[PDB]
RNA sequence: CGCAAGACGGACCAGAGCGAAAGCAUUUGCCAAGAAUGUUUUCAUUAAUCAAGAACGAAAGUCGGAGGUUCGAAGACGAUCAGAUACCGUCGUAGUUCCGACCAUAAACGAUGCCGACCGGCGAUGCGGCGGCGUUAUUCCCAUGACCCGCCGGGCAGCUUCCGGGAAACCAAAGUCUUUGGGUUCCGGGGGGAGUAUGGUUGCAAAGCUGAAACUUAAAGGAAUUGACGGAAGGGCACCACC
């Protein structure tokens, strides 16, 4: 952001995930859920958070599929969007 | 890198395009508990010593 | 390639099966047995048969062979197969019993036994293998 | 003669799926029709992991993986020996090979 | 002869017949 | 067999079934075997109704004792579990044993050396012993089969619902039915228990044979 | 099973089978005596109510509509009635 | 590092869903619609299939605008080859994208018209409802979710079977067929000629729908079997193969 002298002082410009991890998370036979939030902080910083989420096969679950309903997914996405606006 | 000696503990199979190379489990007689799989020309029996001009390659198994 | 042909093995099996008691483990004695109890026109075939005979005799010393029969068949499948213990594994003091196996005994005449320990039921109804 | 009951693809109540481009060629293949692999793979095979572990800055560094999903046309797949012609009885086995 | 290219040749031949019948009208 | 005190299920016979586990059927169910089941457990096991097991045991025993020639009731098991039990059933009933590897065409091909031609088959498992059932289709052979909740009743002509999987339960069912045919012939009385032990008919793990040989000394 | 007693099925079988497919067509719904704790009187609610059942002068809401068997408000007891 | 424009919605994505079919996949909102379940709601035969007639109808193609990122018929060039107006490669106009009108065809396929009844089993799965031990979240329980175990109805399917059918492949429908008749629409009659000529009709055009005959011919074809062959896959053998 600025240089004092023999010192490049840095400021936040974006969190990211290593695609090693990002790809690792995305496996078949479960619902991938995403939510973006165009948000502003207290000071004049405008962020675009991207959440991600994966439905969990339960401990006693025998069924392979492990999917969600469309209204369940968009209730989750509405929650994600609410929580990320709340914490920014 | 030094020139080391390894003993044939087991001759696994016969690899090579014309089956011309014995594929061999070699035990390093310097570091007596380090073992690798390694391709060898000519007739090899169990318990003859190979002269390795490097000890860092490892052959791909049958 | 020292694989014995059907003519060697069939002959060698029948020679053991019919003249078991005349044979032993030595090659050279049962070579001369095979000379007497069979009319073999070759010397080489005589040796082949005598050789496989001796191999099957060593196999019979270990245990019973799939393609031959011994006279009693044979003190283990006949005599030892008449094994009887002191008391049967059936004759149990405390027989554990399911609550629903207790119910079908109650809808039988046998609603009250002395030696049936009715157990607590299997909670967490989870008994299958997951799919895929 | 009808060779495959499913017709060699996996649509039963659609009548259309979207074409994928075959990775080897550029052939347009129905998604359900395409022979799909999911190759997880270590960025270095066997000879280079020996060298990285020794020349790593870090303390017992777990190496990252390279997650491709390959889509093949039937021709590419058979030529590259991904799938393979089977006997008319053995065709019906939908079990993936071990 | 592929039945599609047969159908293409019969269309061109028709298209020349409609071109030559028109010149008397 | 029905509404008779003489041939009614006794108290000691229930304890021989509960120890053996002949009531304790498989996880899966055949539609032809829903009538020979009391109820399903929690932890997916079907409980066989032992009264109906007992009536099918008597009906089978009747079928065997009706066969005037005791020799031509061919008794079959392929699986190790039955191979002892069926061989001791031959000793008792005077039946013909085929213990392991039923050669196809032993009922159909004359020129075969082991060409048997019975009046009645007895079968330890309709699935394992599918080949005897199928050759009973080609020659008019009624078939008694020791059946599980899982077993299909294709070509089986009187089914005895059991655990035919477990080592004890098989040998016990063979013992029960050997003792019943000898009772119903009038060879043995019914008041006293039978000299032959039900434990005799049980197949043993070759581990257990060398474990007994170790524990005998 | 060839010989099914279609004349006389066991009650377990007809309770299992679809309402229209039974030997004699019989509904799976019922009426029930429902009472809220505020009001005295007992209103007859239909099991599959499909309307917001109120008491006299709306003392409270009793029955909320759902897919099938309508849910009764927490604190409202019911006895199913027969003839 | 940015910025712009125009395409397209990977992975999740399935023998999963929805739609009459063509077809449909980023988020959010609005607009109407729909199957299925639930119902001790209502009307009371209002139905099924359908000449005429009508809506929708992939892609390509056409006409007028807006746009043109990528790809790319035609074209030009470089290669290969004997030639190579191909396959390969670099460019590249129409087109590909959007709106308004045409067009009415596809291997538009499940190559299987629609409605109704009956005739084995089993495990799944999608939707809705019903019942049931137990785990789990909202903790503060209620009741709702996530599971588990079953039942019912409708759905895409699956496996198995001497139901039965079929020339067979195969088909719980392609069965209930010489023991031939539940209702109804379309349509085939050896192979070519030919979906041609001709007339009509629709279209701006391309072309669509309707549509013969003369003549010619003993087979064309379907399913399956055995061989031979392969520039398909795998296995084995030989110093008339190799190392």
From Swiss-Prot, chain B:
Keywords: Acetylation, Cytoplasm, Endoplasmic reticulum, Nucleus, Phosphoprotein, Ribonucleoprotein, Ribosomal protein. GO terms for cellular component: cytosolic ribosome; cytosolic small ribosomal subunit; nucleolus; rough endoplasmic reticulum; small-subunit processome; synapse. The modification Phosphoserine is found at residue 35. GO terms for biological process: cytoplasmic translation; maturation of SSU-rRNA; ribosomal small subunit assembly. Its main location: cytoplasm. PROSITE patterns: RIBOSOMAL_S28E (PS00961). It is found in: Cytoplasm, Cytosol; Cytoplasm; Rough endoplasmic reticulum; Nucleus, Nucleolus. The keyword Signal does not apply. One of its GO terms (molecular function) is structural constituent of ribosome. HAMAP family: Ribosomal_eS28 (MF_00292). Component of the small ribosomal subunit. The ribosome is a large ribonucleoprotein complex responsible for the synthesis of proteins in the cell. Part of the small subunit (SSU) processome, first precursor of the small eukaryotic ribosomal subunit. During the assembly of the SSU processome in the nucleolus, many ribosome biogenesis factors, an RNA chaperone and ribosomal proteins associate with the nascent pre-rRNA and work in concert to generate RNA folding, modifications, rearrangements and cleavage as well as targeted degradation of pre-ribosomal RNA by the RNA exosome. Belongs to the eukaryotic ribosomal protein eS28 family. This is Small ribosomal subunit protein eS28. It comes from Oryctolagus cuniculus (Rabbit). The gene is RPS28.
Swiss-Prot record, chain C:
SUPFAM superfamilies: Rps17e-like (SSF116820). The keyword DNA damage does not apply. Ubiquitinated at Lys-102 by RNF14 and RNF25 in response to ribosome collisions (ribosome stalling). It is found in: Cytoplasm; Nucleus, Nucleolus. Keywords: Cytoplasm, Isopeptide bond, Nucleus, Phosphoprotein, Ribonucleoprotein, Ribosomal protein, Ubl conjugation. InterPro entries: Ribosomal_eS17 (IPR001210), Ribosomal_eS17_CS (IPR018273), Ribosomal_eS17_sf (IPR036401). The modification Phosphoserine is found at residue 112. Its main location: cytoplasm. The keyword Signal does not apply. One of its GO terms (cellular component) is nucleolus. GO terms for biological process: translation. There is a cross-link at residue 102 (Glycyl lysine isopeptide (Lys-Gly) (interchain with G-Cter in SUMO1)). Belongs to the eukaryotic ribosomal protein eS17 family. This is Small ribosomal subunit protein eS17. It comes from Oryctolagus cuniculus.
UniProtKB/Swiss-Prot annotation, chain D:
It is found in: Cytoplasm, Cytosol; Cytoplasm; Rough endoplasmic reticulum. The keyword tRNA-binding does not apply. The modification Phosphoserine is found at residue 53. InterPro entries: Ribosomal_eS26 (IPR000892), Ribosomal_eS26_CS (IPR047864), Ribosomal_eS26_sf (IPR038551). Residues 86-96 have a biased composition (Basic and acidic residues). Gene3D superfamilies: Ribosomal protein S26e (3.30.1740.20). GO terms for biological process: translation. GO terms for molecular function: mRNA binding; structural constituent of ribosome. Zn(2+) binds at residues 22, 25, 73, 76. Keywords: Cytoplasm, Endoplasmic reticulum, Phosphoprotein, Ribonucleoprotein, Ribosomal protein, Zinc. The keyword Ribosomal protein applies. Transmembrane segments: none annotated. One of its GO terms (cellular component) is cytosolic ribosome. It holds the Pfam family Ribosomal_S26e. Component of the 40S small ribosomal subunit. Component of the small ribosomal subunit. The ribosome is a large ribonucleoprotein complex responsible for the synthesis of proteins in the cell. Belongs to the eukaryotic ribosomal protein eS26 family. This is Small ribosomal subunit protein eS26. It comes from Oryctolagus cuniculus. The lineage of its organism: Eukaryota, Metazoa, Chordata, Craniata, Vertebrata. The gene is RPS26.
Curated annotation (Swiss-Prot), chain F:
It is found in: Cell membrane; Cytoplasm; Nucleus. Residues 53-112 are annotated as: Interaction with PPP1R16B. Acylated. Acylation may be a prerequisite for conversion of the monomeric 37 kDa laminin receptor precursor (37LRP) to the mature dimeric 67 kDa laminin receptor (67LR), and may provide a mechanism for membrane association. There is a cross-link at residue 88 (Glycyl lysine isopeptide (Lys-Gly) (interchain with G-Cter in SUMO2)). Residues 160-179 are annotated as: Laminin-binding. One of its GO terms (cellular component) is nucleus. The modification N-acetylserine is found at residue 1. GO terms for molecular function: laminin binding; laminin receptor activity; structural constituent of ribosome; virus receptor activity. Keywords: Acetylation, Cell membrane, Cytoplasm, Host cell receptor for virus entry, Host-virus interaction, Isopeptide bond, Membrane, Nucleus, Phosphoprotein, Receptor, Repeat, Ribonucleoprotein, Ribosomal protein, Ubl conjugation. Coiled coil: none annotated. The modification N6-acetyllysine is found at residues 51, 88. GO terms for biological process: ribosomal small subunit assembly; translation. Belongs to the universal ribosomal protein uS2 family. This protein appears to have acquired a second function as a laminin receptor specifically in the vertebrate lineage. This is Small ribosomal subunit protein uS2. It comes from Oryctolagus cuniculus (Rabbit). The gene is RPSA.
